[PDB]
Design a protein around this ligand. Structure first.
Ligand code: CL
Ligand code: CL
Ligand code: MG
Ligand code: MG
Ligand code: NA
Ligand code: NA
Ligand code: NA
Length: 326
DNA sequence: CCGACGGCGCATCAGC
DNA sequence: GCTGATGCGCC
DNA sequence: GTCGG
């Protein structure tokens, strides 16, 4: 982290644009610049130097010049002092409260953790659980705990049906020493792009994980995606582990490579790779890579037999998961 | 200048 | 009830 | 906010 001060500034600006301004392209621009700066292997000495990096333009270069000179950004100093901005930014830290809900709550005079706790009746299910575990959800998960969680999920899934394959993705698959949550890709040979030969495939797995008290709460749940909460078991006399966010995604088995590419991320890597694909005349999602016809309509799915095949199509050298933490 | 910027699952709601 | 829009979430 | 054409 040679340039932590700058990247922190850009991230705070990014969050302001998302949460307060509701300007999602500005949010993405700021995050893109922070990411490209984060991997730049020199300590940045000027805005001009930064402007040579793709994603950093005139305005960010200016902000970098202010920050290097003064150690701060007046623009952020003012934002931090704005009560309405501060409140909105805070409320969005609750899972299930986005920019829209946050502004609405502040309007109704709900703008603190205390306010939320006493207005539980005003929260939807997701938000209630987000509030319940507000503190826990802001803690990171050490890789050692992720390994324990992996063992539980892989072993319970096997107990349900030996044909399931569960793969832990997200920052974990990118080799991170700590993760924000647990991301599990699931496949079963009964669910392919051609047919669903068994119902409740995701349900059965969620059910089993609940039965063993690993999954503790549910934020949302459909046929292919579970979003919830889990917790490692603790030993006798041992303090409990924090509750953790878990996401499970059931992907057609024959579309595993596109799925694991997607669920491995990072999010910024996915945006960058998908944008590059478009430039190359392809569109990528978690299921397929398809050509774009002259018109602009996606064509048929191209054959994919490895993650690398996807990189080949768009003329990128293959990048291992550990090198995708953008 | 100015259009595009990744792609999609689940929850909630309005209109019919 | 359905469909489409929107919010919020995931990488 | 940045980029490409
Ligand atoms: Cl925007
Ligand atoms: Cl598709
Ligand atoms: Mg994750
Ligand atoms: Mg994330
Ligand atoms: Na640049
Ligand atoms: Na939130
Ligand atoms: Na996740």
């Amino acid at each position: 982290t040679l340039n932590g001060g700058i990247t922190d500034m850009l991230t705070e600006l990014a969050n302001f644009e998302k949460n307060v301004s509701q300007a999602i392209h500005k949010y993405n621009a700021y995050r893109k610049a922070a990411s490209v700066i984060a991997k730049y292997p020199h300590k940045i000495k000027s805005g001009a130097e930064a402007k040579k990096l793709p994603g950093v333009g005139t305005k960010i270069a200016e902000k970098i010049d202010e920050f290097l000179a003064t150690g701060k950004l007046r623009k952020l100093e003012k934002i931090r002092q704005d009560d309405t901005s501060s409140s909105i930014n805070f409320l969005t830290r609750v899972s299930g409260i986005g920019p829209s809900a946050a502004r609405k709550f502040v309007d109704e005079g709900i703008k603190t953790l205390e306010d939320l706790r006493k207005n539980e009746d005003k929260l939807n299910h997701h938000q209630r659980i987000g509030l319940k575990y507000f503190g826990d959800f802001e803690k990171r998960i050490p890789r050692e705990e992720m390994l324990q969680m992996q063992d539980i999920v892989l072993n319970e899934v096997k107990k349900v049906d030996s044909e399931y394959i569960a793969t832990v993705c997200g920052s974990f698959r990118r080799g991170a020493e700590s993760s924000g949550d647990m991301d599990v890709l699931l496949t079963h040979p009964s669910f392919t792009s051609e047919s669903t030969k068994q119902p409740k495939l995701l349900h059965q797995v969620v059910e089993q994980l609940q039965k063993v008290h690993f999954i503790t709460d549910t934020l949302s749940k459909g046929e292919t995606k579970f979003m919830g909460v889990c917790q490692l078991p603790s030993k006798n006399d041992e303090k409990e582990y924090p509750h953790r966010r878990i996401d499970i995604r059931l992907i057609p088995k024959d579309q595993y490579y596109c799925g694991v590419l997607y669920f491995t991320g990072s999010d910024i890597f996915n945006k960058n790779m998908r944008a590059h694909a478009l430039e190359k005349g392809f569109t990528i999602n978690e299921y397929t890579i398809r050509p774009l016809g002259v018109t602009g309509v996606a064509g048929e799915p191209l054959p994919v037999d490895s993650e690398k095949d996807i990189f080949d199509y768009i003329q990128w050298k293959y990048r291992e998961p550990k090198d995708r933490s953008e």
